[PDB]
Structure formats: structure tokens, C-alpha cells
């Protein structure tokens, strides 16, 4: 069966991140072992400890974090322990042999770079979690800020399906606002596509936004259709985190692995800025290309034919990492991503027959918003059967009687 | 009289009652999930989680649009074999019997005991009581101004008291069941 592996974002940690699939396996077991061998030895704390307890403040090397409401919930810890989870659970999935091999490997926002290392292998884990750690780390003081620690920038998450806007004109209506406010507004998430969206500004921006979308619902009926994301204050997938892609870009460089096979990805792998499949075909470049400005790219565009015969590897080594980079300063397309998934092969689109994601029971966001497209009238007859790593293990490893 | 049997939607009459700080009388048919929570996707995925744990089942298609009436013919028709009290109703239910009765100290059996002997009913009944008690005996508000807890206010700290609530909770039960 042709599946997907969706691999969920931020806003899924909880003290106790599936410990009871530690105990479970053995594969498990030892994935878990040599992440956290390997993240004391270099990073300096111990991945176990912040996951099965949930400590108020740690010492790395040399510096050292808190939190008010637990060290998992800092950006760097979070990232490290969702990455070291989704890793067992695929561990464990693939070790009981119900693991189909050529899935296609997607993720959310940040879940890509876990998808990547688990669902592929292009690279291993340990430089997984060393990058992320590092860019974790360095992306809380990209912005500006008070010293008090606020930010100027917030992001709420809108449903306009209640406020009787369609999909069309969400963008138009976005743009019409901050020209009125003469502020910085821009989409992010696109998660779901009648009744999701995320939309990340300045402060003021924001106050116009929810005060007119509230005229706007008492206007027609009541709903609650804006809730302010709590904690993140940093836009990511904005233009403003532009500024960073370079140093970000020089890191994958260095880290990414030289010699990769292209095989390992293509046709495997979909990326977010761009919903496309990956693949090797100049209108693919090109559509990343003017998408976004990307420098080392331009040579491929000016030359594809011989660069494609002669340096294969390389060429694709290029466009991933461009790809991988740029992704974290552009709004994630999850819309283009669910429908190109759903949609049945006569119809132009991969015909996928069941969508499990490498999620936790407690807070399963990618398969409600699976769910919830699914159910959306404008496909009723979908025969696409939506499964989670967690909630449903009986259905998903085979093993539920009657 | 016949014993009333606390079948998968008692369970999850008192699971969204409890999720939403409400009581199972104040809750009318046509409520839905998605009505109670206001759209407040917070606390749905919690609501949701609890509700499969307690019915030891997977996704409930369509239960944040089904109302309480759908809601309750499917966990029924799912939940055939609903257990007792579940995980999240046990520790719900044990926990507001603690805090409700640490002075006084009685036991949930000695209240099934008041519906057994002193009002003469099956063990379904004793389990109906409990949870009346369970809810009514909670301290806080509702979410409109209703009364939050209806039975007592306050932990309980003598023996009357637990008694009279008991009695208070089996007449509430049988009126909303017309016994």
C-alpha cells in the first residue's frame, strides 16, 4: 500500500513523550540510548532526562536555561526530544516489520527535518540533532526585542469559515489590512483549507486583525474564529526571518553529507515551500527559483542539460539543501501538500491509501487536520484511511482482534 | 426499584460534564461538543483523548459535530463493553471524593452502601449516586453563572453531611430518570 508519513510540528510535547514505546521494543530502547549517549556527550544535557522528567531549569556546557512551566518547552529542547521520538517510533515500527519501505516522506514545519533523517536516511540522527540544536538556539535572539524579553512580533491562528470569507480571498483580505495599518502582516500556516490558518505580525497589526474579524463574526454569527497562539513570539515562515537564511544555508553546507543518492529522495520526498514532489525537472527548479531568490541555484538554471548529465549528484545536493534551507523563512503550504496527497492518481495528484503520522496519542494536530480535510464536502468518497502512530499502534501494527 | 445500568453514555455524560466543569442535569440533548467548548480547540484534543480512553476506542468520526444524542447512540453502539470506571472518570471521580470528604474520611463504598441498604437499589444505581456526588460536590463556577456544584458546597466533614448529600444525589437521579 503506496502510504505517507507526515510528521507533526511544534505544540505536540508533554512531559513523558512516549516512554512506554521505550519500554515496548528493544529497537526503541536502543535508539533512545544512543541519542541520549550522544546528545550528553556533545550538547551537554541529557535528552532522556528532559523528556521522561520535565525539569524547571538545566546547565548545558556552558550556559545554562529555564523555564517557568518546564525546560521541554524551550524551542532547542523541544526540537531535540520531538526529533529523538519520531526517531524510536519509526525505530520500533520498522523493527515489527510493518513499515512500507518507498513511503514518500513529508512533514510539517519542522517535522521535515525528522521525516528526513527517519523516513529516508539521507542523514543519520546525530547531525539531526546537532544542526537542529545549534539553529534552535540561535533563532530565539534573531529578532529584536525589549530587554523585559517581549518581541515585537505574534502569530494567531484565524478560522475564517465562520466569518463567511472563502479560501480565494484570504491573502487579498490579509494584504487589504495591513495596507489599511500600514503594518507587517503575513500568512504562515496554511493548515486547513476552509477553517484553519495561521498569520503572524507586529503587535498593532494584530489588534486590527482580530478587532475587525470580531465585528466581522458578531456580525454574522458566533464561532470564536481567532485564538492568539500562546508562548511563540517569533514569525517564522515570515519575510523577516530572511536575514538569517545565509548562515543557515553555510550550515547545511558544511554538515550536509557530500556524497548522497539522489534515488534516496526522489519521488520521496515533499517538500514545503514548495507542495511539488520532489523531483529533477527544470520547471521544478525554476518554480523554487522565482519562488524565492537563491544565488547558488542561478548557475543551474543557466546550464541544465550537461550539468544534469555530468554532476547529477551534485546538482541535486544543491537544490536540496537551497530547498532545506529557504524552507524555514517561507510560509509552510500544508494545503497543497494534503490535496497533491489526496487527490486520486487520474486527477493529477498521488494517490495515497492511507496517511499515518509519527505523532503522540495526547495531541494528534496532523491527523486532525487530515481528518478534517477528509471530511471537507469537496471529496466525500475518499477511500483514504487516516491512522496514528500512537492512538491507533493496534490498528496500525496489526494487532487488534474482534 | 430496577437497577439502572451505567452504560458508555453515563460515561460520557459524566466525562464532557466533568471537562467542562458542568453537570449532567444543567447539559440539554441538543448540546454538542463543539456548543459546550465554544470553539476552543484546546480543549478538544484533550476532551477527545479522555473520551477514547475512558471507551477504549480509537477516532469517533464526526464527535465534535454530533450532538449529545448522536454522541451517545454511537459511544453505546461502539462502547459495548464499557467498563465500569474507566481511567479518566477513576481518577476524576476517587480525586473529588478525597477533596470532598478528607475531613469526614468516608470511603465511595460507604456511598454505594447508602444506596444498597438505606435505599434498597442495584450496584448501577450506586454507581449513578457516586458520580452525582462526584459532580454536584465540586467547588468553582459554571461557565453561565449556573450553580457550579448543586449537592453541597464545600468538603464534607461529618457524617450527616456525606448522608444528606447522598440522599440529595439519589433523588436527583431518579428524577432525571423519572424513578
Given at each position: 500500500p503506496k502510504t505517507v508519513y507526515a510528521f507533526p510540528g511544534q505544540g505536540i510535547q508533554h512531559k513523558g513523550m512516549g516512554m512506554e514505546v521505550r519500554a515496548r521494543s528493544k529497537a526503541a530502547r536502543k535508539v533512545w540510548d544512543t541519542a541520549d549517549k550522544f546528545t550528553r556527550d556533545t550538547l551537554g544535557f541529557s535528552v532522556l532526562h528532559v523528556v521522561r522528567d520535565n525539569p524547571t531549569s538545566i546547565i548545558a556546557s556552558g550556559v545554562h536555561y529555564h523555564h517557568p512551566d518546564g525546560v521541554l518547552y524551550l524551542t532547542q529542547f523541544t526540537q531535540v526530544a520531538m526529533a529523538t521520538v519520531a526517531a524510536a517510533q519509526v525505530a520500533e515500527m520498522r523493527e515489527q516489520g510493518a513499515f512500507v519501505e518507498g513511503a514518500i516522506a513529508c512533514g510539517h514545519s519542522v517535522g521535515e527535518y525528522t521525516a528526513l533523517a527517519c523516513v529516508t536516511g539521507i542523514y543519520q540522527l546525530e547531525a539531526l540533532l546537532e544542526?537542529?540544536?545549534?539553529?534552535?538556539?540561535?533563532?530565539?535572539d534573531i529578532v529584536p526585542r525589549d530587554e523585559l524579553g517581549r518581541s515585537n512580533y505574534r502569530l494567531a491562528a484565524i478560522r475564517p469559515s465562520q466569518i463567511d470569507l472563502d479560501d480565494a480571498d484570504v491573502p487579498a483580505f490579509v494584504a487589504g489590512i495591513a495596507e489599511s495599518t500600514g503594518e507587517f502582516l503575513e500568512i504562515v500556516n496554511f493548515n486547513l483549507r476552509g477553517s484553519q490558518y495561521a498569520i503572524a505580525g507586529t503587535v498593532r497589526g494584530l489588534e486590527a486583525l482580530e478587532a475587525e474579524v470580531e465585528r466581522r463574526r458578531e456580525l454574522t454569527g458566533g464561532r470564536r474564529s481567532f485564538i492568539l497562539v500562546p508562548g511563540i513570539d517569533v514569525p517564522f515562515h515570515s519575510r523577516v526571518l530572511?536575514?538569517?537564511?545565509?548562515?543557515?544555508?553555510?550550515?547545511l553546507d558544511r554538515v550536509m553529507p557530500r556524497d548522497a543518492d539522489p534515488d534516496l529522495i526522489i519521488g520521496r520526498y515533499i517538500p514545503n515551500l514548495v507542495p511539488r514532489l520532489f523531483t529533477l525537472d527544470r520547471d521544478f527548479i525554476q518554480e523554487i527559483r522565482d519562488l524565492v531568490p537563491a544565488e547558488p541555484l542561478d548557475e543551474i538554471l543557466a546550464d541544465y542539460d550537461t550539468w544534469l548529465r555530468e554532476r547529477p549528484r551534485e546538482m541535486a545536493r544543491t537544490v536540496f539543501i537551497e530547498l532545506l534551507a529557504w524552507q524555514f523563512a517561507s510560509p509552510v503550504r500544508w494545503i497543497e501538500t494534503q490535496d497533491l496527497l489526496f487527490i486520486e492518481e487520474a486527477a493529477g495528484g498521488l494517490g495515497v491509501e492511507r496517511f499515518v503520522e509519527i505523532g503522540v496519542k495526547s495531541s494528534p494536530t496532523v491527523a486532525g487536520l487530515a481528518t478534517n480535510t477528509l471530511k471537507l464536502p469537496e471529496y466525500a468518497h475518499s477511500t483514504v484511511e487516516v491512522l496514528n502512530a500512537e492512538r491507533d499502534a493496534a490498528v496500525l501494527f496489526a494487532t487488534d482482534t474482534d
Amino acid at each position: 500500500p503506496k502510504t505517507v508519513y507526515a510528521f507533526p510540528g511544534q505544540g505536540i510535547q508533554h512531559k513523558g513523550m512516549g516512554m512506554e514505546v521505550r519500554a515496548r521494543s528493544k529497537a526503541a530502547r536502543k535508539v533512545w540510548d544512543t541519542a541520549d549517549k550522544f546528545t550528553r556527550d556533545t550538547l551537554g544535557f541529557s535528552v532522556l532526562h528532559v523528556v521522561r522528567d520535565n525539569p524547571t531549569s538545566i546547565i548545558a556546557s556552558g550556559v545554562h536555561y529555564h523555564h517557568p512551566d518546564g525546560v521541554l518547552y524551550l524551542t532547542q529542547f523541544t526540537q531535540v526530544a520531538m526529533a529523538t521520538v519520531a526517531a524510536a517510533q519509526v525505530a520500533e515500527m520498522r523493527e515489527q516489520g510493518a513499515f512500507v519501505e518507498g513511503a514518500i516522506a513529508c512533514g510539517h514545519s519542522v517535522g521535515e527535518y525528522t521525516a528526513l533523517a527517519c523516513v529516508t536516511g539521507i542523514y543519520q540522527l546525530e547531525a539531526l540533532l546537532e544542526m537542529v540544536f545549534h539553529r534552535g538556539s540561535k533563532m530565539h535572539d534573531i529578532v529584536p526585542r525589549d530587554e523585559l524579553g517581549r518581541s515585537n512580533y505574534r502569530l494567531a491562528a484565524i478560522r475564517p469559515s465562520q466569518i463567511d470569507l472563502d479560501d480565494a480571498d484570504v491573502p487579498a483580505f490579509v494584504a487589504g489590512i495591513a495596507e489599511s495599518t500600514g503594518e507587517f502582516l503575513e500568512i504562515v500556516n496554511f493548515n486547513l483549507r476552509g477553517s484553519q490558518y495561521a498569520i503572524a505580525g507586529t503587535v498593532r497589526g494584530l489588534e486590527a486583525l482580530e478587532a475587525e474579524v470580531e465585528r466581522r463574526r458578531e456580525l454574522t454569527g458566533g464561532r470564536r474564529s481567532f485564538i492568539l497562539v500562546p508562548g511563540i513570539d517569533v514569525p517564522f515562515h515570515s519575510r523577516v526571518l530572511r536575514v538569517g537564511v545565509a548562515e543557515f544555508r553555510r550550515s547545511l553546507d558544511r554538515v550536509m553529507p557530500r556524497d548522497a543518492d539522489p534515488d534516496l529522495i526522489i519521488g520521496r520526498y515533499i517538500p514545503n515551500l514548495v507542495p511539488r514532489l520532489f523531483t529533477l525537472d527544470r520547471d521544478f527548479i525554476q518554480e523554487i527559483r522565482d519562488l524565492v531568490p537563491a544565488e547558488p541555484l542561478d548557475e543551474i538554471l543557466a546550464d541544465y542539460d550537461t550539468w544534469l548529465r555530468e554532476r547529477p549528484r551534485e546538482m541535486a545536493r544543491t537544490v536540496f539543501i537551497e530547498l532545506l534551507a529557504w524552507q524555514f523563512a517561507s510560509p509552510v503550504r500544508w494545503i497543497e501538500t494534503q490535496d497533491l496527497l489526496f487527490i486520486e492518481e487520474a486527477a493529477g495528484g498521488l494517490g495515497v491509501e492511507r496517511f499515518v503520522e509519527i505523532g503522540v496519542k495526547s495531541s494528534p494536530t496532523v491527523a486532525g487536520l487530515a481528518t478534517n480535510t477528509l471530511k471537507l464536502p469537496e471529496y466525500a468518497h475518499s477511500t483514504v484511511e487516516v491512522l496514528n502512530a500512537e492512538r491507533d499502534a493496534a490498528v496500525l501494527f496489526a494487532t487488534d482482534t474482534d
